[model samples]
Target chain A: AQRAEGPATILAIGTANPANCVEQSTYPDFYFKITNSEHKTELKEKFQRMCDKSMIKRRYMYLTEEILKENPNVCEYMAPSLDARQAMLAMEVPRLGKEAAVKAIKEWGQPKSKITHLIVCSTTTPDLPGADYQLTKLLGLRPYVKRVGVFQHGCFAGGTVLRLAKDLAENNKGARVLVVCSEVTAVTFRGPSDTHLDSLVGQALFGDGAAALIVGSDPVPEIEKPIFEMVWTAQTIAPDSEGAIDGHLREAGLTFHLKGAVPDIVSKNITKALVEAFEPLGISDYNSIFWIAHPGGPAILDQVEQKLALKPEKMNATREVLSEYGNMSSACVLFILDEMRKKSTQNGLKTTGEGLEWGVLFGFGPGLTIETVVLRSVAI
Target chain B: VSVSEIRKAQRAEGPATILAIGTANPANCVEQSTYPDFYFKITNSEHKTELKEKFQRMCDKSMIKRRYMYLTEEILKENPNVCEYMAPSLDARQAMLAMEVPRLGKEAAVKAIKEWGQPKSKITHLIVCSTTTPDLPGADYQLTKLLGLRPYVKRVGVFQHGCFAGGTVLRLAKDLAENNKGARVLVVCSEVTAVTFRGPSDTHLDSLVGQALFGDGAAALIVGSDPVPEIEKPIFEMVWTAQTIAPDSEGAIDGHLREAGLTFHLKGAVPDIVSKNITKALVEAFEPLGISDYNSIFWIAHPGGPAILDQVEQKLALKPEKMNATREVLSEYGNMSSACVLFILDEMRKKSTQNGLKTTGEGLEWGVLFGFGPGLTIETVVLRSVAI
Candidate 1:
């Protein structure tokens, strides 16, 4: 079988968020008021305390106060609001994804028709003529562009898409794969409940965001610039961690049953996974490699750092994305990649990946699944 | 400096091949002749006699003998919300599918694994496709647990691709298998009608067509490249795959997730659109193989309905026997969504072997599999039959 001349590389990256930005400092007040839960002062205080320490300064969302006012069912806990939520997602997911994709295509400096493949990852939109199909139309991509729709992958989907794009790009010659991860938190937004503290954690952390990247092998010399070479990819589910991070789509839109042991499960296994991922490259120094980890939350990042015994600056890119955008699920890792590259360039680093030639991308989600991709940064 | 030298060494020697196939259905089966009465009775919609009669007419012309369903009388009666014509039943429907989709998938996958004559750990990848269940830690994850597959088995979930997913997943498996040496991908297409079941509506005739046509079923296939000569056998060699969307067919086969669960607006023009574009699609798929004779090739197509099958038969000028496999599967199982085409493929292989045909593809050396669904999407895969 004939194959590409090199490993798949990230040619360009773009990210977008909805226009409405809410300050984390005031979100507790806004959340309680919108849900008409102002009377539950105890819960409100607890939520405020959680928000204060969340490390997220602000987050963007497609759901605004005006929209929630019209759709009161969405603001009520356990309300049958899936119809309205799905309706909003059907329109917004593709629209936001298109914005990100346009920027990626622009950065890649390629015609839309050159994108022979489109892989879309999302947890929100699951209906037919999926976000993938809608994005093709929105971007006016070639009608014959092959498309793969990945749904319900949760946060690890960013890593999933990159792995898929790597295979598709490396397996086929002259293949330009456009990968998109679009997510909106509106589907899971609901009034906090006394019984489900996990839902509160989600409400405090999740935000709306979309990210897109152009991935391909055998870059067109001067025309295409390779940012990060996707050298290897692997995925593993932590032992006995099946229900650690779970979610289901129901009449109330999306409901998550997140277990508290998620951070512990990830931290316990991160070292071994990283060892295996980097063993092929024969590199073991943790600090020498740049890290683009999914900022699932503050605790997950802290645990990974503590377990690896890495210097604080190694996690700056991940922490920065988390602070500004919160956990955008599948789109967060790409945002980190975009941020890392920009910060590196701003600081006059030799490479986009924080000046490191070797880096790794991590995504952890439901199934306590961990996705590891070994990356090699291309010099500027 | 090129990593391609290292990566190319990992590539397999040949294209992907179907090593083993298995299919399963729910326990409850209803004869198509009595489906109208049973549906009306269960939904307490016997009062809508005119609509029931229309549904009965559709069933009679449906070319289906019986269909298995996960939804049972006891289940529906206990949950009146699901029985309502248009109620907020997505949650309940999704709950039933979350448990049943993977359970059914495991039943089919077990047979495939056994037939593959390999250990469970040998399965390196799993691709699970379902339009009914869209939950995190999806069916792919649950199936791994149910089958006791290796924890590191790479999983790809194909949700909401509609019926064409059977072809889509196989196409993906082809790349994964051929690009990664020793990669054995288990492809599972599982579907349940529970998500789309609804009491017939006066304004929506398409719902009646869907209710009469769709069924519950799952099919599993072991796809790999460069089969071990003594250990593994190849059924169909997957040669080439292509997908294309018809022009101006945006909403031709629309499906929406709503309060009343998943509803579809299947345009009557679907067969016509497929009829108009299928020939060109097939020509494009076979052109690279340097084949132009449609009659000489066997056909394994998704029986979307009698009309869809009829369009292909008429357009391709294929012999009536060319569609026997598809028609027989459709008769026994109705339209199982993404799983139907695989069932047809399995049936074709069984028939060829039983009749002692020269090749697994009904004695033909070449064939094409067609999967059609939303996007007015057409997924085509060219296959070369393997001799027993």
Candidate 2:
């Protein structure tokens, strides 16, 4: 593994963690129970009215004091998801969020800290000491860390970030950059609602999450062998549906609003988007029976699966993780890849009877942008 | 590379150092209100039904054992008088700064530099990041002149990056660490999230979500090249960094307050947005760190909210206890934007990692820090502990 700075390799993908987590079994009943139900006799009733539920449970992550505080206003204002201070810091700062980006550079430097350029990707709520800024301090590196901040781009960002890092790494061997994908999702949920729009989307779907990674010239026994080699990145944007998914930063809080027509927008244009993203790679088999797609929702996942004619098993990891974790914004695809990688780490995932060759990573965001990165997972 | 370019570049081979860092915060205030007292004063014989319901569902977010802010007192005084449920402050500049950077005070800020283990006041460049509101030719320049750093200090400020900046800022610092071996630079970030509050609207679930979860704060980082005169060896060694942008997800949704308190609107699909990306981010992130094994994981989190951390745990399949640092930070101080991680790191210092905790780096107890921001970015880092 002699500095194969050809494109980029994820020598190490570590998740810097905090303390504890709430499990599905303990999730749904996590906070202030519904004392008076404007729409609930049972929690199940609440679920049915909001979003469909299959496996795991749902719960607000806040503590008892915060949950059942004693504010006559609590019932009306409490969002189902909320982590205390530290959890929030880890997610947004150094764990799967921002801080992790800075720490990633401390060990996996390019040929002993030879990194030149850095590209940061994210679409969650953001503020100061950005990817390029804060990372420099945390790692205690030089002042010339070439930095780029890519925002408003939706999940599947791990692939997008990798693609960008690859582009930079391919052009400059001296550049072993850092790419991070952090999303503190609980902040996105709107809580129990009254309007049809709110019931359907706002509080019903989102949850908090984030995933950070280091991608660059660093060569690892695993990343160097190119188990999951970076191929090429392609992005597509739809001009017709600009307002499908819009958000506002309000006095109350930040809000992510999805137009009811967004799903339809995807259904209407996904064919063109997919083809556009994969065509450059000489991908012709629509039913190649080997592909990876972003699971925006159960419906979106099903639609993509049907469109691609993918086998149920092909999406096992994706669906399973989604069913359990909810939408972690930027963290979704990373979770799926991690699950897939775990299987590969154990034995092998068969695809063409050739044991799973490649995966297509997808990222969607405002401007109705969609990005894809094709990766080949080889033998470790 | 030119000297300036080299200064902003990453020299992985060089030792880590903290140059000069500054702090800034607004003056607004809030106080912590007691449970019993808050209820007794705010709601009395109001419809028992409503009181019971609000009381039962009072707490909206996670357990922040105890939180301190100038607003805690403010809320107690205002709660009973306000008609609508806890409304977002019309302005949160001061509070946001308090949450993200919490005033270290002039003395503390100064001591931070003196105690930085370095003996130089010759910082070369400065970077400032903030949203809530920034005055042009603003604070960063002010610091340049205020500190009188060689009068040649280069100043840059980051705006519109939003909460995702915690990681972005560090990346910039890493860039600066390159050419400026002995040269020093400082990066600072502050926010007024409490002021961004949305008043009692059609959707008001953030009740507890609004106040207890978010607070104003700032973070300042000092990065420099090779060993400074007094500082023999820096604490942590640099490894590498990463960031990815997850777009289209409507992460920015809270409606704004127009001249008429804008009719709040909640649109777009959510859980689906997050579900769409998060889990996979965990996979892409950790897969790179496992080529070798290390010791313990030192998680310095943003404390955005409870469920957010829970989700990270589930996605990574980490041990349940691994999230304590995040929980403690969130429970005690509330999410203080960029300041959250620094505070956590400050806390981790208590555990003489002299030998350093174990991590993906082996014997190197690698540290992986993560944070999310606009563009819905995911910023990451991996570090090795050199000494206390």
Candidate 3:
């Protein structure tokens, strides 16, 4: 069968962060104060050590320290029921999602009415009229715009939604797909640390944010500003590593189990996933590929940089976002990509030239899943 | 362009095709007649007499005979204190959903994959629609693992959209298939409304209405552009689909997690309001397709309730047989939420061959299906069957 000549291209991107901010300096003390008194001293030291190594200076969140201090005790603050977390998620998702989506459309210079399809992604929030449905109304998108909602797939979802949007744009003539990913990872914070070290690691890392992207089949012919052409996407699951990163919903709230082996597990599997992604593009000189990796953690990034032989320049974008926002869950990739564009444009990489720069974007979710997308900067 | 060029263009342009479907029901059945006794035995309401009388009347008017569910009699017997007034905790409902939904959904999906006449790996996209439960590593991922599809197959989880998700998933499946050549999308709707069963909430008519309705069932469908050589002709060719929200219809059907599990508030005016509002949208959709004569096309309504069906029929001037399949499924299974209409489609396919329907005049050449749910949303799909 003859498929469309070209896949979907990224026309524009926008990101939004929650208003509340937590400085990295005070986070460990906050964590220590919020822990049950029995293990407060020990956990506080562990948290401090983790914080020192985290490399993240500050992260935005919906639940500020003041909110956490509202409860009389650490147990009361940390052990909120599933309803409490969901209520917070639902309240924050639409507001943040709309902000990202409107800004994305505005950046793309398109009327909201022209969007033919809207695909919404998230892991921490569940809603009847999910983020996609809410954003459509909020943005005043076309009434007949197609709606697709994906949740609980974890951080890899930003790339997953782009692939879906690519399919929609490729299949339907004149179809422009709008993709949005919003996450309130703050809800994953467990006040009373799980006995497991991995659970404590997750509570230390996650933050809250949302992102939106405009993707379509054709780019404007004349002076179509800087946009990244989505070349292709590939994904593979690691063998026997499904349990390495465990995220589940409990009566208390959303819980995550990230093993100490996660960085190594990702490092071990990165070669195979990358080789498969690169073989199709006929590129082997890892230097030619600009690496856009999900900042799973400083350890994950360190291992990726070492394995792929990436220089500090190639790893800067991922590190910058991680330092600024911690891991904003699925929205982290777009944040990194946003920073990459600013840095690139400032370097005089204009859309006016025929020069092509290849970029490889990577994200990891549960199932030990690693997804890679080969992106290119095109003059056309 | 030549015919082959046209074919390539169509392939390149993309729109998904409907192949076949599989459905699964629970082993145990709950008869409507036994509902009142079951309700009175397990439930305690402030106004027990009024609740009992109201429940009985609605259950009778429900036009339901028996419905299937995952929660067994023994399970209910063990939870003596758990009743409509005393709702189940979030943990209990999520646990039940995690166990039964995937199992039942798998049971149905295996059959769907088998009848689809394709290797499991050939299925590129898996869309799981369920409002029954929400869990991490969602039902979509679980169903993928259950069906043994490729680890990297594209996955979509359509949650929280109520019954209208049946139409939503189908539309999405079409978009994926049509856009990607040879793309085979598996769309599944697995709902366990029993998990949300509360004995009685007489505060609003919706609470009482919710108790009298809803059962459990799962439906799986294969939609793609690839031809199934085993079948002489594909079951149906998706023509066009459209969705719209009824103006001022937000609260007619609203759902969210509550103290006692997931609950839906269905206002009594939903059916009337939906039917009245949905007509213009349906007419707008159908008129453009030139499928005006109800005689030439079969109608598959969601059977949200007897009132909703009756109102739609009255507005469309459709005869009883036009919705016989919907009425039959509702009578036997109540409103299985998103799974109800798919069950009707499965039943419709059972008696009909690739050639056509055996009983209906010259078999069904065309079908128009409509699904209504939260957001006062109306989703409609127009289908054209292929000849042998």
Candidate 4:
């Protein structure tokens, strides 16, 4: 019945990506060539145009030409390839998650055994004794480390896990929660289809990556330092928008049916969500607060910017991550957070939160869900 | 200084407690005695007489009278691929689960909300657990839509943690409720055997156990700290929670989501392994409470199987009545996976009320809820029963 003395804060962050880095400029050619779809030149041109407008410079992928060649079922669109996809995920998801977690633990300057809780979130893997269980063995976490697996929650999952970690850390004194969000596109990857252009958008945007964070309430001085103090968290599903972002696990692996109205819905709801999150703190000026929004796509970022009417630099870190890594689903926001802090450090800012004391991290995903986390940066 | 003030404003004064409970099952009830004939008939596999006999033997020893299933004979006949043991039937199974998992969970949640005697909007958090369905905008989101919960309600989707996910979700709800004062967490665990249902395979006998035992059901509970004096009543106070993996027990309950729906290996040594570790688990759970007399506490254990219940009873030297709730639930509904323990808890409270006991937990002040699943994982929650 004891509680931590302070709010949950991010102690350390680490991110990892698969080895196969593909330039977005050449992705259309690479994708068409790998899928043996060079004959569909018109469709390829359209895909290239989308990629040009995607605001992504490059993206990492776990599926290479050799992997696709070896597993033809996975390469073919609408093929019954879940088994093969899951088998690959069972290995790579945990391995990639462990790589990121190792870095997080190293930066936290804490032994892996000190982690009292593990929260692993992913849309790519949905199997028992899943990445959460596997990470314990891989990272040598304690046998009794309470593990929570958040699966199929979509891109907002990064916010979901962080919210859960905040509660777990603050409720249990000295509880160190290692939060990991790993995503791979192999589960949803498929050859180009003229009919399913939505799938193509996902194929163009999603990349393989994992992010890990050490979250706890109280920091051990000299051993740990706070990056962003998690002030408050709130989540809301846009009313009557259940069909906006739908994803299903099918025979061909995970498939998403994203309504084009997603950007509009998020834009319409952004002001209210932010107002509710910051109102409790008596903060109202949007420009003064730093932003860490999920880079779902260029359109979403554009919509948020126009709606908030914020300065362009407010989205610089988010855009930078998207340009480099594309959207890694639940792990994308964490990548942005890491980028933001690194940039702040390089510039010798007063705080990791873009030199601002107050910030908000936004995550948008299925359920047309919006996850907002109010943050107060700790001084350097 | 501000951090301390914020922390003080957020936390609750009391431990999280179960405010109310509800459970539901699909309408298709199949008796265990005739499930073999029913399964074979539906699958068009009555020709496999020896296999049907083997399944019948397994069912007879399963200690289950009947089970509810979302997969009906008509449905199976319509979707023949689902009846095949190794057919690529995940799409069909997943589609069915997506619709039914939330629908059934809504039924249970409605009842729990009714029992809690509060508006649905009062619920501040939602935690949904299931291994049967894995989809984005998952069952948690769908349940929120179904129950018309407030859009601001925090949701946690716990998918594919196997049977112990009920305990896992409850543990999470406990933290959410206790850490955020005035928070009411609606926790639901729903499982349908449609994901794991398939024809009998001669090569895979372990799956036969699953076919004989697994059932379809959903359980919902309202969890909160510091209940309102007149409007709310507490059932069981969650005192502490712990989870431990039994040593060298990997692959004991290995389950994979395959193209052919879910395929799992239920090792025969599961009951023995649980028996071996139950004492240690109990000691670890109860040591902090300073309790050693095993018989003094009531037990609300997941009825994984009759063998598991028998072993747990034998291992702990518990009175036969200590397992009555679990046995009765198993007999009536078979193993509903993560939802089974909650169903047993509900049954225990009802039985105690019927017997005119002072408390819901078989008239005992202290108890433990056990959930066994993959990793040979043992999830234990120490409980303190409150007077009704």
Candidate 5:
């Protein structure tokens, strides 16, 4: 294969949180109207999920311009529903609404001409007018964009698309694939302190964001080789685990139901999957590579890092990204990649055949399908 | 390798369909005014002859409940903008998709998949089969994310084939394991036949029949090289599969290139013309392997249209009961396109799997995975048992 590199890295990355990332005051009226649950079980559920926060509250619907005035990128955003309690992801949101959201996402990604593949991943909803349809009109992607939509990847699905993107990019067609991962957590919120629904407070930690990565064999005109090259990857799955983490649908919206078995099972198996992946990279130390695993929840990234025995400095980017911005499905990895890319580029650390295999990326879903890929700095 | 040859050659058991049972709408309905004997008592009218064939064929109401859209020049309150490019009917495209295939969200649609795949659904592979969706995402991945199948489950969505088409999915799933062998594979087929109904100034009864005889539904099953565990027998085993494409069929029976829906059209005499060759292919299914005469045949008759099913029977001399479930399922749910056979297999097993009784008279259980598609081609699959 061909190899290339670039010296200017992705340096300081920042994430903005939704101002009204809401507390109870915003929910009660709808909550009382629908559930009629006094919700006496706060300890078991949690506040975020009590209203569908994480395990507490289910989701946070996007408030209108009047409701929210923080985001600078608001003009283009045709907001999704804000009634978190009643939002039934699979049922409530119509195709037109989804079309507007996609159009906005696609438009925000301006200068779309340089893109090769439009990789779309979403666990929120399904319809004919998906990301691919919008990209076609928005990007004027030739013929049909070498388009691939990865759906139902759950929280990890976004990771799955990256792996797929890595595969497409590796073909070296000067492939500059743009990946988009979006989810409206509030769309499936049930009520307050609803266990797994509340645990979604993890999502409350989440703010909608997208990162445009220029993954290509051709550098940005004059930039030295590209900063990262995807190396070894595996999307291994563990079967018969559907019961542990389930997402259900009703006429109202999608509800995320977790069985508490996920994190522990992940704790047990994460090492094996990572070790198997790392052996091929000819390195026994994952602690050495930049770890950009999806920051599933507060404990998730920590659990993974602890297992790997990663250095405090090594996890600095991962923690800062997750603590501040939360996880944006697959975009979480890009956040880390963006953070590390800048640092490595400034230091000229991308040496594909030499050392420092940039970082490892992975995600988990229904089959417990883990989309894992390694990116070593390579010149396009 | 020949699917059969590979079956025999492997010795290594690949995934065979362990179970395939499902449901659809029933085939009858009742009018508001009974006016009991308003027929015989009042005018003494002969309903057997006076009623439309669709109504005549139907015997009872409590069958499967079917929902319908009230048509008008204006867009529907819920599904607005369903109109199309003109000619057939402005909403023809949406009508067609609404007729045969429509988008299925993960939460609601996947529940259908899970229901059909019940008692135990250890799906290793999930495939969402459809052709109406030009650039849409396959609902199967949604099953993983929302419904939570194993995450590593591979997803393959089929497109290009028109309505009453599932043979494409079968071929895809079979090869899915062929390249990477496995005992777990699940195919979820859901298609609403109402997506393409275009009311006509001069409606041909044939098109009317096609329109009236279709509905939306979903079905799923597990195909292991092994049979359903503890159950002891599978619905079927591998024999062979062959495909023949008729480009004219592909061009004529085109789905949507860009539109909201379409209509059901049978320009040429399809099955009656294709029946003889299809039968030859069935016999050839055994010929290559030197195997002959299946003791029983579970024919998954694609109810592409009315005449096609009967013509096939006349040519093949198939036992009436060979397709009892298929007939019943089609009549009730109309023709749910891809999910028809799966529903048939699902329902059939619900009756037979417990005691292993033959609902279709005296034919042994032979897993026959068959379907018709845009290629106007035919795909026939022979299996060893029907327990799958």
Candidate 6:
């Protein structure tokens, strides 16, 4: 097949989480029992209240009741070594990624052989031959599938990978790209310490999950499944905001650092970022669009809505995902987009649109990066 | 919207052009002939005899004469506590990567950027590839910030992708620059295999082989849809790129993460595995372009090892002189991983300039490049010299 011209279309998305799930309310209890802390009583109370206000009802982890039961004080006992955690990532990431990609391929109703390109994104693990090639063996993908990998880019990498998929699909007609984003936050979790503010917020925020989506140049055929048309992609990095999101590679794994001002910083600069995307298409108002913000946190979502003057429901899907899975890091945006697509397919969810539905997808990560993708519905 | 409607406005953009390549190597040089003597001191005496015999045999067979590394021989000679058997921890290696990568990377990048002669702001894309070290913001981000590239420059990172990454990044740059009008991409490939050193291995011959062959280097290229005004004839016009993987060879080479740092696990079947599979992959890459005779094309194959190069030469049955550039690079720089191809390209250009080679001709115009990596991935890029 010759190369095709045009941005790729997102045909289908699939998501998977770890087997173990912890209810938000019960997290405080789980933490109290499993953790032996020297922190003040008020600090524990504060943590409990913070967990309740986190807007996350449940979070999935590689850790299960069986492991927890066997090692009751594991949280305080000791975090796993880097090699042990990476060993875990090596084994589990593929299983979780395979589970996600299968559903996406099945939903697309296309043969798995259609995949001509594979791009994998992850920040939690950089184990190699790269996790991207792992999919080739696990999924029995075509031997010649062109593979590319993006690593340690943080959350906004999903958008970057999709743009890469779009560019490749555009260059080579009839090419189908399978994009996988996976993260195992449980392994990177820092040991219990109130003094570590970054981990305090990070531990409450991240979860373990993986998501896969199939993108192709075959434009939307209204007769079949609904798919998002790739319209345009825009990206920006905030000046002097590199310190806002940083991670250090330690013996325990990546120690994530998130400044408290991250939400405020994003809110202040979001308008410029929004315009860089929307202005190209002559889009001015936020009300006429569906939004899938990264949902980095409840505060971030709230700030984005208020600063942009967007309707409360503009971020419903994103907020709902935060409530369900917390932030899955690089995998979060895909999961959010997946939930959005699921809702629309099930209930035909829309807002003031009779023909084409306009939507904006946004994500932020290291370098205080802002990535946005505009989607105009090509589905009926 | 129907499929036709979406593609109606999708006009075919012109292909991206390759302008110039710049390569840089660390100062510390390892003279290969005497390395066996050096190897004898740092290893355990219990296993020294066997290891020494095997090392000398490999070194004797190896075509390499010298290699560059960020970690000098002095690091061991100066410190009694630091023996050859005592490798640096992952953290120490990582710190070294963070320190030396930006410096070495910028040196190569600045040359390419300068030779491109375009405003840094005009460069709309930056693609950096590395498999040696992992850092958040990674080396790519560090590069952009240090180089003072525009804030809006779209950065694409190819990390942990192995040796095939050089060709992959170039392909990606073409996709971006051609698809977007007036876009110029700065492509950088940097690797510090020295930092990947895992001390001395008593059990694995593969580890010893890896140490002898792998070197440290960086290469930068500027790719755009428009040719540079300064270059009377630009380097090469990227015609097409093709990639293939050997699934059965998946476990033959492993670049896994370990507490010591990233470990490169190689099976004894490397030379055999690559030779058995690479020709078929090359056939696929060339079949589409009607490149039936390799003799007609200039070759810039990745010098993975002497054996792989020897096998390819035998299979193609080309003149002994066709891969002199590749042999020279392997002999001088060893296998610099992702940066090897560009370094070979640099040497090819130097030779072409010295010999006054024409930009276009039946035999001299076309070039075929091949790079192999983990997963036994074979990536090829087809090129044509352009007389602008």
Q: Model 5 residue B81 lDDT? A: 42
Clash count for candidate 6 is 4
Cα displacement (Å) at residue A100, model 5: 14
Tens digit of lDDT per residue, candidate 2, span A280-301?
5566665552345556666666
Angstrom error of the Cα, residue A100, model 6: value is 1.2
Q: Candidates 4 and 6: which is better by DockQ?
A: 4
Candidate with best lDDT:
1
Clashes of each: 0, 271, 4, 0, 118, 4
lDDT of 1 by residue, B274-326 (tens): 89998899778888777898889988888998998887788878888888999
Per-residue accuracy of model 3 over A24-82 as CA lDDT, tens digit each: 99887666665544456776788788889999999888876676666333235335366
Chain A TM-score of prediction number 3: 0.92
Which of the predicted structures, 1 or 2, would earn the higher DockQ when compared with the native? 1
lDDT of 2 by residue, B1-388 (tens): 2212321332232534444434333454333334424433443424444443443344444566544343444553453323234333332333333333323332224545665755435665566665433222233433444444443354444555555567666655654554334446666665555344332322454443444456655556677657555554355544566665455543333333221222122235433444356556545556677632212555655666666676666655667656666676676667666567655554454344443644222233566666654334566765565433
* lDDT (10s digit) by residue, model 4, range A28-78: 888898988999999998898889999999999999888999998877788
Name the regions of candidate 1 deviating beyond 4 angstroms: B1-5
Better of 2 and 5 by lDDT: 2
lDDT of 6 by residue, A1-380 (tens): 35675557787889998888878888766665556453456666867777877999999998765554554334542343676567667878888989999988888887888788898877855466888888788999888788887788888887888778878887787788899998887456544665776677776778888899888875556523546777777777887687888876655677777888898988999888777767756678888877878878899888888887887877888888998899888788888777776677677654212233787888788888888887776544
Please give, for residues B1-388, the per-residue lDDT of candidate 5 as tens digits: 1222322332224444444433433222323123122222222233434443333333222133332223322333234343211232223443334333323423234444454354334565666765443222234544456555655555654433445346646644553433233336666566644445433212354443443445556565555554446553355455445455433442334333222244444556676556655667677676665545533555566776556677777776776766667677656555567776666665565656455665421235445666765435566666654422
Winner by DockQ: 4
TM-score of 6: 0.93
Better of 1 and 4 by DockQ: 4
Query: How good is model 5 by TM-score?
Result: 0.50
DockQ of each model against the real complex?
Answer: 0.71, 0.03, 0.46, 0.75, 0.04, 0.60
Candidate lDDT scores, in order, read 0.88, 0.49, 0.75, 0.88, 0.48, 0.77
Q: What is the TM-score of chain B alone in each candidate?
A: 0.97, 0.72, 0.90, 0.97, 0.69, 0.90
* Per-residue accuracy of model 5 over A1-380 as CA lDDT, tens digit each: 22122211221122222334444334444333343444454532344243343221222245433422332222111222222222223332222223333443343343555555565555543333334434444444443234444544466665555545543454333546655555554444333344345334433444444444444433444432345554444565555565555553322334455555666566667887777666654667766766666666655555666776777676666666665555555556766766665555556654431235446666654445566765555431
Worst 10 residues of 3 chain A by lDDT: A71-80
